Design a binder for this molecule. Sequence first.
Ligand SMILES: [Mg+2]
Ligand SMILES: [Mg+2]
Ligand SMILES: [Mg+2]
Ligand SMILES: [Mg+2]
Ligand SMILES: [Mg+2]
Lengths: 385, 385, 384, 384, 384
Amino acid sequence: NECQLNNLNALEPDHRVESEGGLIETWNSQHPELQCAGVTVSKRTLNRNGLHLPSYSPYPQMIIVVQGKGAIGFAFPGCPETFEKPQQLQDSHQKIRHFNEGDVLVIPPGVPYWTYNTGDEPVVAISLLDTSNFNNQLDQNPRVFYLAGNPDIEHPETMQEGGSVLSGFSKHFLAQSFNTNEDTAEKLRSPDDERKQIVTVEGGLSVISPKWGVEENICTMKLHENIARPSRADFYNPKAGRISTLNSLTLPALRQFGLSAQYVVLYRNGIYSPHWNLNANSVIYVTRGKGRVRVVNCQGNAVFDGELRRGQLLVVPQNFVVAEQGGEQGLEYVVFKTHHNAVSSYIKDVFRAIPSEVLSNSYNLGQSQVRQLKYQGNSGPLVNP
Amino acid sequence: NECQLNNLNALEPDHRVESEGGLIETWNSQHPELQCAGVTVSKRTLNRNGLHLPSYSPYPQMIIVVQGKGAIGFAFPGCPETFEKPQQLQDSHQKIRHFNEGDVLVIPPGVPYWTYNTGDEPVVAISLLDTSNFNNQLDQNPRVFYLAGNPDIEHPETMQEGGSVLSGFSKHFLAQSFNTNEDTAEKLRSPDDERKQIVTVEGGLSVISPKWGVEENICTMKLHENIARPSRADFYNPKAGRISTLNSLTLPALRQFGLSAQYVVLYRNGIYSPHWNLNANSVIYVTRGKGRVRVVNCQGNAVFDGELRRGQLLVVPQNFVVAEQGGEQGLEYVVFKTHHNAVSSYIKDVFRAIPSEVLSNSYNLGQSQVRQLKYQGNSGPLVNP
Amino acid sequence: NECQLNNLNALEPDHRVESEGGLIETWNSQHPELQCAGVTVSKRTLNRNGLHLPSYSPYPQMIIVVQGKGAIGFAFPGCPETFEKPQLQDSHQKIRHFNEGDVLVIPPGVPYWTYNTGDEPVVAISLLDTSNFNNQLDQNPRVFYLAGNPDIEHPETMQEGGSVLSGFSKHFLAQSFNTNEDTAEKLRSPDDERKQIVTVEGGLSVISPKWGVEENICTMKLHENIARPSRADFYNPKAGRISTLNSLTLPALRQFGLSAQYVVLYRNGIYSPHWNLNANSVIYVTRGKGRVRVVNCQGNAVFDGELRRGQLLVVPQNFVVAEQGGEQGLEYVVFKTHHNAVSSYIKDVFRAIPSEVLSNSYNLGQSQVRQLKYQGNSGPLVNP
Amino acid sequence: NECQLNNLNALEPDHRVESEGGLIETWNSQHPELQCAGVTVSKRTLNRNGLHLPSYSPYPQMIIVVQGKGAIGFAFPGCPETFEKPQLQDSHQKIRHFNEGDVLVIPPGVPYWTYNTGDEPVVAISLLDTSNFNNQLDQNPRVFYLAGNPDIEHPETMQEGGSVLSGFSKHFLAQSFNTNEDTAEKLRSPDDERKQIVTVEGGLSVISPKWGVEENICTMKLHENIARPSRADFYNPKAGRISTLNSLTLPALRQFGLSAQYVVLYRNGIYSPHWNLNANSVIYVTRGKGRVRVVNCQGNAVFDGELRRGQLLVVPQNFVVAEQGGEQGLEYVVFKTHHNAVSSYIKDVFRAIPSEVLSNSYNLGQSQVRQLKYQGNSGPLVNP
Amino acid sequence: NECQLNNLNALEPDHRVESEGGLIETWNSQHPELQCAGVTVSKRTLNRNGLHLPSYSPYPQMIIVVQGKGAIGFAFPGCPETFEKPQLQDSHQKIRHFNEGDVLVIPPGVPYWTYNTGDEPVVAISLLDTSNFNNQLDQNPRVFYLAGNPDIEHPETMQEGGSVLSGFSKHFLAQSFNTNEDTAEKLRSPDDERKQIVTVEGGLSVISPKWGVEENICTMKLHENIARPSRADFYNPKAGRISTLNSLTLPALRQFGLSAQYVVLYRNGIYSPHWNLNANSVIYVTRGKGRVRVVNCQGNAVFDGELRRGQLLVVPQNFVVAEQGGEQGLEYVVFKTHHNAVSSYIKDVFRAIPSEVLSNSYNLGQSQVRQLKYQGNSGPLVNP
Ligand SMILES: [Mg+2]
Ligand SMILES: [Mg+2]
Ligand SMILES: [Mg+2]
Ligand SMILES: [Mg+2]
Ligand SMILES: [Mg+2]
């Protein structure tokens, strides 16, 4: 009965991990709303020259960059290092991908990744940790395997200290394994490192990049897409707002990760009429502004009815009906959905699909009243009252 | 250990919901047999002019109409209203599908649907609610989201009153959302409606129908097929009975819903020899007659051994061996299976696949005895003793 | 440049084969229109007690039954005989019943036979998808009979003949099938003058209620009604109806590259200008008469005239077509060479394009544009 | 034997169509090279306020925008009008914006229109995949215009013309669209002398932020940037960069059998000997100049010369090719007739083969072999 | 009408290429039979210490090894060198061992080389699937050698030649591969008179036990034994055995459109009348002799005669064929142009059809019909 919730709360971060080069804030995965959704969320901040040390988790992550710009690099197993710099190579590594605010990034399960702030302002990103994803064969707990550094626990609720996976091996064995000296091997264990999982790169970081076979396809799996730019809108009403969808039809990698998302922008008083998601739980994170949100369950009860503003997280269970109205300054938010091609339906459109007399007898309405419901007013889900 | 059942009971409806235009009977989803199967069942009756108000659930439903005739209409999101009637349109809606006794209907997860009795006798349908379906991201509880009316709870065991999803919103907000007046909006909340989920349409219902791009495919997803007609038999022995299979190879939509079924008709003394389902749990609902049924588990124990008659439900767990023999008046039943292409095997056929000497040494049988088992008698699963 | 056609003709059968229990009429596969579409057509009539002897072809066939009722049986390789009557008096694969309005699908290489179970004759029109990707021989229609002594159904290809079994000696057939020379001789149909469709005196009798690998593949759905009023996917009570049959309704079609639609236009009903995005089409009028127009990429009406019952008209991929029912309406089936053929009607296109793009495109005023987009019924079926 | 070519030529447009708001230049589809690859190319220029009238073709088109910025709109059949401005002043399908460096994909049979939103003209090169499996007509390029009075863009195929709507009478158009004869007459573009690309005086205005089935299919991604420096999949700061665009980045390509790469070579940068395993390729130089060599199975350089901006060069499947940037570098797009074209460069091949196989193959000493395998950069982009 | 063949011939190689370490014999791709099937065949013999230099072709090849033992290595693009011997003395991709009875599959565009590891010569028959959908060039067989100075293996297509590397200058090769002119000169095989198969004096030595992307794609299964007695899918100890190799046993075949069967008939053993539903077939006799008969749709035996070791016989899709082992039996491989070719034998067909349909079809009595259906072994392999 994990989703038999009579109340839904707007949630904010519960735990904080302050590092040399940044901050990591996590929502406790044990909140009943998040347990129903089968996910948890993590907000990461990379300060100037901030470098998030390489790590991987046993489930996919969908991240939206809400501030700043940087680069992310993955370590795909067995793939060639297509970025090379001659000194005889002086260095070579895999493709460096750049991201900006409004972009969504996807981290594959088990694939190592690192990120770096390439701008002046701090990078702020919100990550949906899809812990319940079918690909996670461990358990519901969020887990982060660091390949470097001496991290602090990011999800403390699961401990009921941190260390890299390399610190679990002796320097002697690492020395032999990696055909290196024990001095190098000891450093690989981060024995005296006190910077934690996000460090500051003094002097700035330098990597091979134009801007700063298997290689053509798989090894270059597209893992980022802008979702917030106005021009990418899929639904639009100049006087109400816009809705943009990012799913497996845009980012094919999502098909195997069971995740998709939408970015919604509602202008002052703009309304996103009553709608529901047919095949997925959803998690709203407000990126800006404020608005009135209402979520109704199968008993016609509003499990949530209140203001929702920047920084808050609100779970909308599969099939529950939700509606939003932009406040004074409008409202913007991303909605993570636990399906690679999540589909929703809005009630206005439903009325149009049902025969006039079915509607009349259902709501005891007159022919003219029904007609006005099915044919009058703007057609889309975005309404300017 | 949800399926470690040492006993299986023939089950009948536990709860009843009497409405103006019909009746809804449900089997408690907490019976251990149903918990093992990961499903529950609901029997619906639409009286003359009976209209089942529009609703949707977060899992698929496979329904078999055992009596009467009517029409069902769905509300596919974003699809065009291909049925239109000029007065300038006087009304338009989506395709109306007709059904008759012996037909199976499939309801997609999250898709709204309504049904209406177009004949004189009442429509009686038995619905398999596939609550454990992978697409249900909530929890095991059955749930019905009504878009209209003031319903009573159909699965009371989950409350440990009813209302439409629209009654969860204020008339003022619905008024703005749907660009209508507050009078219409208040009626949309069904504030004074006491008819419940199945209403009687006085004077009969009228909808657009010849009989009473995306539109060509998806928006017209085939969601009904006759399963009981004699001529649709897949296995047949004039002196024993018949077996008909309905799976994803006949109704492609079933591939995504993980459901299939069979309709079996056994004549007097007709036998459906010992067989089992390799990849799916099964739920038998007797539509007519009576017969002796035996279910044996992995310890060689008959967890069920008795008469099974019209109206009773019997779960047959995956891999358990079952056999049926038509009684005096014969036996007819539908079997819902929780796989889009459920496959079964009958022991007679198994003997034929195993080498004679493997059989001899397995059962201490003589060469002649084995030969008679593998080659003598009718070949199929339907036996006339 | 097989489709660089400046003219399209309404075609009727050009060849006929008279047999004891029926008739087979075919359209010459060499007509420029049929060559562009990469198919040919065949009309088969089974008289009372008529039986079409077992045969198979290296490509799929989509058949619409326009009259009568009957049964069709296939021989799926290696599949068990699930129909049996108790030693076994007899056993055979599933028997499938059909009626007028039904569409049957014949898989490539799979033997099938048909029998008329009613009094009136069975009349069926078959689209022989010769250009199908599964046909690795050549674009010529071919029929491999397993029995009888047939006459060539498509003579244009030759530019006599027996069953495939007649190509073997009775001696070898006797050894192969572990049978005696007497039976083996008969398997070659040496003195059979009945041709491919025979009359079963006394009537045919088979195992059937009304008259593992099994559960699925071995008994896959190969027939579906397409003409019933209630099956309409598009409908305007004052104009007509359109029904679509594709891989979403009949899964096997996914592998055969074929789909169809059944159109019924009432008096003066119009199926407004539309085109198929991904497939060539072949119209066969089953009833009535109406005006049909087909326009190519140069804006030329390669066809502009009446089309009546029994006539065939090819509509090439992307060519724009429109139809209007005559005094007694018009009904027709449209075979399309794609498992999920998609069409688009111009009215709907106007709705998708911005007003000013339309205004500047056709030199129209905002008002007139508003007219095209929001006035009238929105569907493709129009009541003028 | 269309590809049994002993010679390959660098080709430039041979035909041109001047219209009011733009220009269309095409390469003759009959060049032996283009026939072997089964495609043709078209360069389209939209001048300021230029609008390319609605049209569709029976095959997919892959377009790279080499200059300017604009908007492209498609008309997906049966899809809802998700862009609306409040009765509705107007509503239409999604508007997609593009800039130089972007690749656009046009689905078969789907109408599309484009508009220049900037001051400089929009220049785009389109690969018309005429041999695509979805094209069931013939290998001839065809353009079905929904509006205007166009001139033939590919005249070689004829060996006048209007919109598909001009093929209908104004009377029938009036009845079909429930409109008056006046509007219907205009829908036929009878006195339009502007041709296929027109100039929108005052500028075009549409619904857009900057200027169910919806969520997915109805709004599928049909454009992606391929030329930005940051999108490089291969990179050597001293030699150049290679970017790949295929079905893994743009899903729709899976159904259209097309992919591409954008190559940028710096001064004297070399893209070492490589070949495409599963597709024919067509290079179009967007900037600079360089030496290109193409070798067939006989070890003959069917092409060995300079290739500069605006020139087209076909590289047949499996033929080995190499390029070297000139004094000012070389940039080019390569269209490939496969949704996921795979290539292989010889340097990498040496690494995969055992030393002694190599030694015995080329009569080299262990030392020299060691040279080929482990010395130098490992990638395909070489700085000599 | 390439398959409208009234006659089929048993074919033997017509051309030969003698090289230092082996021999290559080919069948002319222009034989009417081979053109109908859309393929050609090649027999390759590697003498002791023989090495077939690296090469690749724009279509898949299915090869059955009829004699000897050896190793085959491929060069998968961008894949890591997982075989290494410690700086690295050397590293290269996986080495795959094969023996007689094994079938090897060569992917389109992928370089491969083979080496004889035994004393007796390796003899292999290769089905060159030139008509494969992946081949976007033309139906001509082509071999792109990466090394050596080969002679044309399929001369009929020309109606000299070197390696693809010989098409480049040594200067450019030196720059491309970061090597010196000396090595580069050698990469062009200028004074090599050994041809495509060379003799490795002293024997070849490679990394191998016996002599991420890795785990999967980069090391996909490309070989499987098909001839071992124990692998039989069909078996009658008194008649023979049939083994099938398709995409269900070797996944890669799904992408190459090929499958095969290995048939062994004992003395007088019969493979009763059967046909392939979805593919053309090419028989190659590996041992013995027997009577083969092929009947077309007119009931004419387009082939009726003996077929012995080393002979090739095409059996077109849907044509009915039967074989009977001679005094010393008959063994043969059958290549089929479909990843999952399906066949059907007439005996099984009789079992699927109702008694009365059969009675009326062949004018047989209930008794005789009962004979065909239930008497004798039920399988396709018959002991007369
Ligand atoms: Mg929302
Ligand atoms: Mg049962
Ligand atoms: Mg039509
Ligand atoms: Mg290139
Ligand atoms: Mg054979």
